[PDB]
Point group: C3
Chain length 69, copies 3
């Protein structure tokens, strides 16, 4: 169970950020996630054996935002 | 039939504000509502016998914004 | 096949702009469109015989943004 601060560009709407939190949440592995709209940050916590950042990032880019690598 | 200027924080998108206007609109009581994205204001008008601010606020917070009390 | 820079006000969310690109895209005539969120611009390219700016604008205003005439 790790905790990471993904750097995210492009998030600007409090309503739409709700969907970020929701899709990264529906990922097995994901024990929690909280989107910090103003820091462009998606601090996440999870089971590193059950999901990867790659998916998580992938689930973040499918909303259309940019995950810094 | 009253007219109130709800103070709202978090609204930033012209497209998403459309949904605010729409859900507070579908509330029985609600004779009209207009969202002022730049003043963070949801001036509403309604039948005070047929719906409360509480719901209205509630319908605004379900979009994810913050109704000042 | 023309290429136009529609001036657009109101676009602010990278996620929601995705829907702009998508609906103007589903228009017969439309060979491409790219939304420039920061310039408030919707540079489009199309077959002038198969769709008009009017629709395109119309498809942009249905998202709730303002097409400068
Ligand atoms: Cu939004
Ligand atoms: Cu939006
Ligand atoms: Cu959005």
């Amino acid at each position: 169970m790790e905790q990471k601060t993904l750097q995210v560009e492009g998030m600007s709407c409090q309503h739409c950020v709700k969907a970020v939190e929701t899709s990264v949440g529906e990922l097995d592995g994901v024990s929690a996630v909280h989107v910090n709209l103003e820091a462009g940050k998606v601090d996440v916590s999870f089971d590193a054996d059950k999901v990867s950042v790659k998916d998580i990032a992938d689930a973040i880019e499918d909303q259309g935002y940019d995950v810094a690598k």
